[PDB]
Amino acid sequence: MKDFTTYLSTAPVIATIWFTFTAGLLIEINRYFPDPLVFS
Amino acid sequence: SLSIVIFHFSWKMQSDVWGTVTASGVSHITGGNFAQSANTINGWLRDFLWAQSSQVIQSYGSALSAYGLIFLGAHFVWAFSLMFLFSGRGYWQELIESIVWAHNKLKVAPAIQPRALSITQGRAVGVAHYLLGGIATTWSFFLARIISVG
Amino acid sequence: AHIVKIYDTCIGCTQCVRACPLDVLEMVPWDGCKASQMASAPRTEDCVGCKRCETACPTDFLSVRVYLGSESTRSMGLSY
Amino acid sequence: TKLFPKFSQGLAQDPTTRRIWYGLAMAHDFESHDGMTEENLYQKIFASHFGQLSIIFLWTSGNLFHVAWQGNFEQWVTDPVHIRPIAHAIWDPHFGQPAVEAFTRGGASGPVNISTSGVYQWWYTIGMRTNQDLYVGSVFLALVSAIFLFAGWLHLQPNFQPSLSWFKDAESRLNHHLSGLFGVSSLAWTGHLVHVAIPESRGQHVGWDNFLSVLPHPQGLTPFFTGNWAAYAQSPDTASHVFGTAQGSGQAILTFLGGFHPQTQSLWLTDMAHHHLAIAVIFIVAGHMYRTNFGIGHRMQAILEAHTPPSGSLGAGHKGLFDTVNNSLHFQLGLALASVGTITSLVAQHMYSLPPYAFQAIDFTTQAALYTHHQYIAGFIMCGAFAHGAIFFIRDYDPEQNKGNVLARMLDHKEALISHLSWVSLFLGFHTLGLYVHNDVMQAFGTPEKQILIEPVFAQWIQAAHGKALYGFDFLLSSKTSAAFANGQSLWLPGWLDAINNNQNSLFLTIGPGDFLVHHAIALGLHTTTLILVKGALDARGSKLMPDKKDFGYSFPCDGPGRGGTCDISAYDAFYLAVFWMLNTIGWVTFYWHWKHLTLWQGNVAQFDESSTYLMGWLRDYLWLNSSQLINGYNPFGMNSLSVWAWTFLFGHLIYATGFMFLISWRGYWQELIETLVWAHEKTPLANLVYWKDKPVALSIVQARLVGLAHFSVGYIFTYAAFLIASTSGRFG
Amino acid sequence: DIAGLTPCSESKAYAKLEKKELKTLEKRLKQYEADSAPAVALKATMERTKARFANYAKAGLLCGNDGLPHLIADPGLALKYGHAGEVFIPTFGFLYVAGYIGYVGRQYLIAVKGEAKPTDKEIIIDVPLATKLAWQGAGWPLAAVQELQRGTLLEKEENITVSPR
Amino acid sequence: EVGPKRGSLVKILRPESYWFNQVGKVVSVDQSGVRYPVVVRFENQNYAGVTTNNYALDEVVAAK
Amino acid sequence: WTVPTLNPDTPSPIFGGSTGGLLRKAQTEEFYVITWEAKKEQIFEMPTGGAAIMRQGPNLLKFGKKEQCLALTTQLRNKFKLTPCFYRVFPDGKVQYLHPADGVYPEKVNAGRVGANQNMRRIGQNVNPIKVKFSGRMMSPAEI
Ligand code: CLA
Ligand code: CLA
Ligand code: CLA
Ligand code: CLA
Ligand code: CLA
Ligand SMILES: CC1=C(/C=C/C(C)=C/C=C/C(C)=C/C=C/C=C(C)/C=C/C=C(C)/C=C/C2=C(C)CCCC2(C)C)C(C)(C)CCC1
Ligand SMILES: CC1=C(C/C=C(\C)CCC[C@H](C)CCC[C@H](C)CCCC(C)C)C(=O)c2ccccc2C1=O
Ligand SMILES: CC1=C(C/C=C(\C)CCC[C@H](C)CCC[C@H](C)CCCC(C)C)C(=O)c2ccccc2C1=O
Ligand code: SF4
Ligand code: SF4
């Protein structure tokens, strides 16, 4: 399990999780606040 | 060589095979203009590439608008590849030296030393982007065209 | 003919001589390094300019340098 | 050994074809010739300049001759609005009868080409009215060409060769060139305008046969010698004047009207006369600044030595620079190309918006060609300016003699310079490309109101300061209460304000969000091209990957595959890569100029305002839409006068694509292929009787980059030239 | 208004644009049923379209002759006429996030330089350390400024390698 | 008795070296009067992959 | 050690032949001959392409350029542990011997060799290009 969690810490795995999280947050924000153009 | 093969197939079928059957006869999509026009390079530029690309460039605002975007994006990737094909890593390694200096100045230089791609990887990156851009350009152009009229 | 120069930072590893595919370089006695030998370039008229010697030199900066110069049948590597 | 080239024994001893190619390519690099000395270097360059001057005046003579012989100048001057100028006649035995008929036009005897260089409007403006006027000019310039050619021969002779010190007399040359070459030439040109051009614009003929008995002004030189110089500005040409005729004309020879002639839509001749008189006085005065044999004036070395900031911010300051500049021809050539290259851009910018030649504006094809012509030439000159600055560092720069001065300190912080140019290029590219792609996605999804359109407020604020009242800033010349508005209200503002607020002319065109994006793309082009060129110069003398690059010269193939690989590491290669970005930058500039003007010339400016904010609009509404007539120049049904541009359009695409071969595939592949061709020839019966004298070899590494870049550039230029002329001329012409 | 623009709420072209987009959606609607899946989706799109055009007008944007919103970038003009939310406020919104990301990465890079094998800490991320630095980055502008004043932000010129000159 | 101590850190002053203005660890110092006796090791390799190089006494200075 | 004399009648390996051999250059400018002793008959790879069988005892081959001879020499030494030597032969009949120039392969240091093209300085101590300008020909600072 220590080695498996080490594998998840490799750069490609971290980037996939990080961008999957980052993209999901942006997608969800635009789902509840569609069409943001001005801060207002 | 395969680009000409799939242009030959696309123009020949639309001109001479595909079409709508009616009382008078068969009217083809491009109206049998292959025989008289495909014997000059100008004919291919005007009658095939310029005329049939009308569908893809008018796709915005419709369900086919995705093909328009990929048509532009494919053109971009193809031209982007010429940067790797026309240059050599000697220029880029020196450029990275100045970029690394700025990071060193700010104590933010990486532990894994940046390196310009190898000579072979420059050629591999170049041809992969050249193929992807070129092939995707035809892909968008074919589907937006044939789906729209075919 | 190309120009090949050996500089006094040579450590006498002999790697340049082994790398050369035209027997342009050779090792000679010396007293300026631990190995007590230095690279030499007595036959530069046969040099083709491949720069395999520079690829093989460990010292930094290089101790063997090749300056491409006038071309000829031998330096242009022609068999016709 | 072979005789050719006579200037290099290394090349002459080469048994391969590289001798032929390299002999041509090193002919004019005098510094590299065998036995060259500094004194002989300057005398060869001086002789070469006479040759260039003779070619220029001979080329001009040929244009004058052919227009007079085969053009329709005398017919065009009568009705310049509705007559296409003729460049020269066509005698092509390959033509078929439909081609002969197609190119017959303008009432000509046979096939002819339509001129696009604007020489008709230029020559008509300066007072030419008949074919004999052009014939005499042609013979005069052919004679002037001969004289310069003789002078080139004369100053190579034993008793007429200048010494080395003669070429390095900086103070005396500047005094003469500023006062005589610039000042007197401009004073003489004022004489032509006052004596010939202006009277011809008012219907009065003035030639060599009667110009001594014709008074340029009713009061002859009395106002001049009495100080009452205002008399020359009374009774100018009225707004009803018909150019070339005496109806509506005036009497003034020096004015400051400041606007456009209402009929010709070009600058007044009396303003261009006062313009050239004004700068002539300034230039003649400015030419009395430097030291000579008369004990007064400055010595440039003293000026440079003085200007060292007392705080040590610029180190040694400008100490030692006089010898650095006075001893290096590449430093001087770099300053000359940089200055001339910028002025070439300025010519293009000001000529399209302040058209100086009568009836130039209405000739849309001429205006498009003139702007594109000079912007592409400016782009090449700028790249050369940096190339020779890079050559200076390798060849002429001496670290010891420039210790601590401004030039040496530029190398001290070269990483800082390059790093910041890199940041600016990345920033502009990311956000410029990003906004375009955002707007493209919005258009694709059918929501044009969601795109990011930024108003060019800073540029629109400048236009307000100049008097453009559309934006409502009411600033300076746009406000009728400002002192700036009041003071100039009696000299030139009435004409200037009238022209700037006319939206049918190109004087400060209205700008919007479409212009915002394109301008920032232009900045990306300038910064990135500068980055490549500046890196090529500052890294020319060495780098971490190649500490001793100076020992190899300006142009060498590489340092081999060791140390990771060193392809394109020389300063020559940095210039080679920068030419691509220069073409890309000038392309964006000329696309922007052309599309914004086509919509203006058709009256539908809204198309540019709406379609220019995303990149599909450019591809659809500019490139694709305006190619319809070009590619129909010849078709399976026939051909028309555009078939030459249709043919040249594909001709450009072919040369461009051929260049890819020299840039993508490199030498090793081709040298091995040529070796089987050598084997095949020797073993073939009846052909091995014939044999070569130069052993065939593949092009060199460096040669193929130049050959590939030459094909790339030529195809680039010929493709757009054919499209630019065909789209503009067919639409209106 | 500013630069000849007019408020989108008062723009004739802006109003006409909304009708065109709604008309296009309505045309596709009438080829389906009342409460079928395609019809519900199209109605949802029309609601968002109407909301979008109301929001932009309510935001007090400026529309050109094209009838499309244009943004004001000059800080003086933005704060003068209440357009701070177009570019000015989002400018400082982005820089906080951009500095956050950059500052967090720089802290992590310095942290592992002290380890025995820094290279292996870059391909294989030290997640416990990264999360610790991720939260502390919220105060980067304060920490960033204090480093600048104490002189530990920049390396010394003598500790940076440069090429021969 | 000549040169820096083994294992100590020195700063390189050869402008043409990849490690100019960088710190390395002294491996050994030749006492035979050779041109470049000092041997220094570095934690970052140069463009050729090498991590060791020989320097003269005056080309290396103690860390700071 | 004395300079060997070439024996033109030395037997050659068993080789069918190929199109990668000598060209008209050999008849007009020069060609190269490599000779060696073989302990046993064995198959080796020709630098011109193909495989040849070396006869037991002396062997002789002719090549178009020097690099081809020294490419075969590397193969024979590294794999078969042989000691080949090759010459330069001119059309006039003159024969020039080289590799090993003095009988000992250059990789091994030998007394009596005189250093050539050795600069008693570093690369970083060369003069600037301006100081070798107008020297009658394009000269690098390293040359002086
Ligand atoms: C009054 C004396 C005088 C004059 C007239 C000249 C004239 C000239 N000298 Mg100079 N020279 C002088 C004294 C003089 N010299 C002295 C005293 C010395 C010794 C110290 C020298 C030493 C010297 C050298 C060593 C060289 C020259 C050269 C030249 C030529 C430069 C190229 C050229 O034609 O530029 C013409 C430039 C202009 C007319 C002005 C260009 C800039 C303007 C602003 C451009 C725009 C103007 C206008 C808008 C354009 C309209 C275009 C039209 C199509 C509408 C030129 C003919 C060079 C040459 O070519 O020699 C053969 C050269 O090599 N001179
Ligand atoms: C270089 C240009 C040039 C030349 C060669 C001429 C030549 C001439 N002009 Mg013109 N003129 C010029 C510029 C020129 N002009 C300009 C710029 C203007 C506008 C201000 C005028 C306005 C003008 C008027 C209004 C009149 C003339 C007249 C004349 C004629 C008689 C002059 C005379 O007898 O003066 C005698 C003067 C002197 C003996 C003293 C001259 C002193 C001045 C300061 C010149 C000093 C030398 C000068 C710096 C040299 C320059 C270079 C040189 C190669 C020309 C003569 C054909 C008159 C005429 O009858 O024409 C048919 C006439 O009425 N000119
Ligand atoms: C007045 C300006 C000027 C002058 C006096 C010079 C002079 C010189 N330059 Mg410089 N240069 C200039 C402008 C100038 N340059 C410009 C504008 C550029 C940017 C493009 C450059 C870029 C440049 C480079 C990159 C180099 C030089 C070099 C040189 C030197 C050797 C030139 C040579 O041998 O050419 C020989 C000429 C050729 C091999 C052919 C030139 C023609 C080209 C290939 C284009 C041909 C196109 C063709 C006609 C199109 C046909 C179309 C078809 C349809 C018919 C020489 C001292 C070289 C040097 O040695 O520097 C130290 C060098 O490396 N120059
Ligand atoms: C369309 C073609 C193209 C493009 C897009 C670029 C782009 C770039 N060039 Mg290049 N170049 C080209 C052609 C091109 N070049 C050609 C033909 C040559 C001749 C050999 C060169 C020669 C050249 C030189 C010599 C230099 C550049 C430089 C640059 C940079 C300029 C700054 C900039 O715009 O930063 C912004 C970056 C971009 C616009 C690049 C594209 C970014 C994309 C859109 C990001 C997409 C990310 C997204 C998440 C999708 C990823 C998907 C993937 C994971 C599957 C940039 C990386 C300069 C440089 O490196 O400066 C630092 C530089 O020195 N170029
Ligand atoms: C990127 C450069 C830039 C440019 C070209 C402009 C341009 C403009 N600004 Mg802006 N501005 C900028 C950056 C810029 N600004 C920045 C970075 C700030 C700080 C965040 C401001 C803050 C600001 C204010 C507070 C005001 C302007 C105003 C103006 C306008 C007139 C005064 C002016 O600035 O003249 C040219 C610009 C410069 C020389 C650069 C510095 C400008 C300073 C910072 C502001 C000057 C204000 C001025 C004294 C106001 C006098 C009253 C006015 C009605 C005449 C003009 C459209 C005024 C306005 O709204 O006019 C309608 C105004 O009140 N600007
Ligand atoms: C590398 C090198 C080099 C080169 C360089 C170059 C090539 C450069 C360029 C440069 C450039 C190309 C620059 C430019 C600049 C410009 C400017 C600086 C401008 C200014 C302007 C102004 C100031 C204006 C003002 C005004 C206005 C705006 C308006 C009104 C009027 C007035 C006038 C007021 C050399 C040779 C030296 C050598 C060494 C190295
Ligand atoms: C542009 C270019 C480069 C420079 C390109 C490089 C160095 C590749 C850049 C790859 C990425 C963008 C950098 C590495 C990114 C990291 C993985 C971190 C990313 C973190 C998140 C943002 C995902 C060459 O090295 C080269 C070499 C040989 C011939 C031509 C060229 C060439 O044209
Ligand atoms: C195609 C190609 C070849 C093969 C091309 C060769 C050998 C040139 C053949 C040219 C023939 C003889 C036609 C030349 C036609 C020109 C119009 C001649 C102009 C002559 C001037 C003096 C005017 C290379 O040798 C090469 C080398 C390095 C990188 C890329 C390439 C490369 O792309
Ligand atoms: S030149 Fe380099 S490879 Fe050759 S002996 Fe000297 S140190 Fe070794
Ligand atoms: S360049 Fe090639 S042939 Fe010349 S000495 Fe070096 S390795 Fe030998």
Swiss-Prot record, chain A:
Keywords: Chloroplast, Membrane, Photosynthesis, Photosystem I, Plastid, Thylakoid, Transmembrane, Transmembrane helix. SUPFAM superfamilies: Subunit IX of photosystem I reaction centre, PsaJ. Its main location: plastid. The keyword Plastid applies. One of its GO terms (biological process) is photosynthesis. HAMAP family: PSI_PsaJ. This is Photosystem I reaction center subunit IX. It is found in: Plastid, Chloroplast thylakoid membrane. The chain crosses the membrane at residues 7-27. It comes from the Eukaryota. It comes from Chlamydomonas reinhardtii. The lineage of its organism: Eukaryota, Viridiplantae, Chlorophyta, core chlorophytes, Chlorophyceae. It is a single-pass membrane protein.
Curated annotation (Swiss-Prot), chain C:
One of its GO terms (cellular component) is chloroplast thylakoid membrane. This is Photosystem I iron-sulfur center. PROSITE patterns: 4FE4S_FER_1, 4FE4S_FER_2. The lineage of its organism: Eukaryota, Viridiplantae, Chlorophyta, core chlorophytes, Chlorophyceae. Residues 1-30, 38-67 form the 4Fe-4S ferredoxin-type domain. [4Fe-4S] cluster 2 binds at residues 20, 47, 50, 53. NCBIfam families: PS_I_psaC. The gene is psaC. Apoprotein for the two 4Fe-4S centers FA and FB of photosystem I (PSI); essential for photochemical activity. FB is the terminal electron acceptor of PSI, donating electrons to ferredoxin. The C-terminus interacts with PsaA/B/D and helps assemble the protein into the PSI complex. Required for binding of PsaD and PsaE to PSI. PSI is a plastocyanin/cytochrome c6-ferredoxin oxidoreductase, converting photonic excitation into a charge separation, which transfers an electron from the donor P700 chlorophyll pair to the spectroscopically characterized acceptors A0, A1, FX, FA and FB in turn. PANTHER family: PHOTOSYSTEM I IRON-SULFUR CENTER, PHOTOSYSTEM I IRON-SULFUR CENTER-RELATED. Its cofactor is [4Fe-4S] cluster. Its main location: plastid. The eukaryotic PSI reaction center is composed of at least 11 subunits. Disulfide bonds: none annotated. The keyword 4Fe-4S applies. Binds 2 [4Fe-4S] clusters. Cluster 2 is most probably the spectroscopically characterized electron acceptor FA and cluster 1 is most probably FB.
Curated annotation (Swiss-Prot), chain D:
Keywords: 4Fe-4S, Chlorophyll, Chloroplast, Chromophore, Electron transport, Iron, Iron-sulfur, Magnesium, Membrane, Metal-binding, Oxidoreductase, Photosynthesis, Photosystem I, Plastid, Thylakoid, Transmembrane, Transmembrane helix, Transport. InterPro entries: PSI_PsaA/B, PSI_PsaA/B_CS, PSI_PsaA/B_sf, PSI_PsaB. The chain crosses the membrane at residues 45-68, 134-157, 174-198, 272-290, 329-352, 368-394, 416-438, 516-534, 574-595, 642-664, 706-726. GO terms for biological process: photosynthesis. Changing residue 561 to L: Assembles functional PSI. Reaction center is somewhat unstable and interaction with PsaC is impaired. Belongs to the PsaA/PsaB family. This is Photosystem I P700 chlorophyll a apoprotein A2. The gene is psaB.
Swiss-Prot record, chain F:
One of its GO terms (cellular component) is photosystem I reaction center. The gene is PSAE. Interacts with ALB3.1, which is essential for its insertion into thylakoid membrane. It comes from Chlamydomonas reinhardtii. One of its GO terms (biological process) is photosynthesis. Keywords: Chloroplast, Membrane, Photosynthesis, Photosystem I, Plastid, Thylakoid, Transit peptide. Stabilizes the interaction between PsaC and the PSI core, assists the docking of the ferredoxin to PSI and interacts with ferredoxin-NADP oxidoreductase. It is found in: Plastid, Chloroplast thylakoid membrane. It is a peripheral membrane protein. This is Photosystem I reaction center subunit IV, chloroplastic.
